[PDB]
Amino acid sequence: PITFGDFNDGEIESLSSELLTFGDFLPGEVDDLTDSD
């Protein structure tokens, strides 16, 4: 349970939801599209 500042275990790890998608985009397809381009 090593957290920093006014954080407990759970918050930012849930705040980074890689499963969330918008439109017809496949998960991470938009990210990859931006990276290395």
Binding site: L15, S17, L19, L20, F22, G23, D24, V30, T34
Partner: protein
């Protein structure tokens, strides 16, 4: 079920990155019968009428001519709305073709899909500049 704040923040990031990188791919954010203004003004000096349908949204997006459209997000507020929707108010600055940054506001209403969970299509997209009204 994720936080409305989570969904709003992630959508804001994805939208305002894809707008800079590949504006022609923005049409894949909306769905059938979705409202998308973003006109600001028309030939008669009035807020542009909403364009409905992915084909119309793509045509208007291409007409806007986004080149290196930089976005400077000052605030993003996400709240839960009807039918497990999310309402996002994004305020900040926008600069197309490396021009002067202009203050803007944008309202997103993202509706989900009973089929795929954690998938949202932008039902409403309203955009306005500060200078065009004040």
């Amino acid at each position: 079920k994720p936080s409305p704040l989570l969904v709003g923040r992630e959508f804001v990031r994805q939208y305002y990155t894809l707008l800079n990188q590949a504006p022609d791919m923005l049409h894949r954010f909306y769905g059938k019968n979705s409202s998308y203004v973003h006109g600001g003004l028309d030939s008669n000096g009035k807020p542009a009428d909403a364009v409905y349908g992915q084909k119309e949204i793509h045509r208007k997006v291409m007409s806007q001519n986004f080149t290196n459209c930089h976005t400077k997000i000052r605030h993003v507020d996400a709240h839960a709305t009807l039918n497990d929707g999310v309402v996002v108010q994004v305020m900040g600055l926008l600069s197309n073709n490396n021009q002067a940054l202009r203050r803007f506001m944008q309202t997103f209403v993202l509706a989900p899909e009973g089929s795929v969970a954690n998938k949202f299509y932008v039902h409403n997209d309203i955009f306005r500049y500060q200078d065009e009204v004040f």
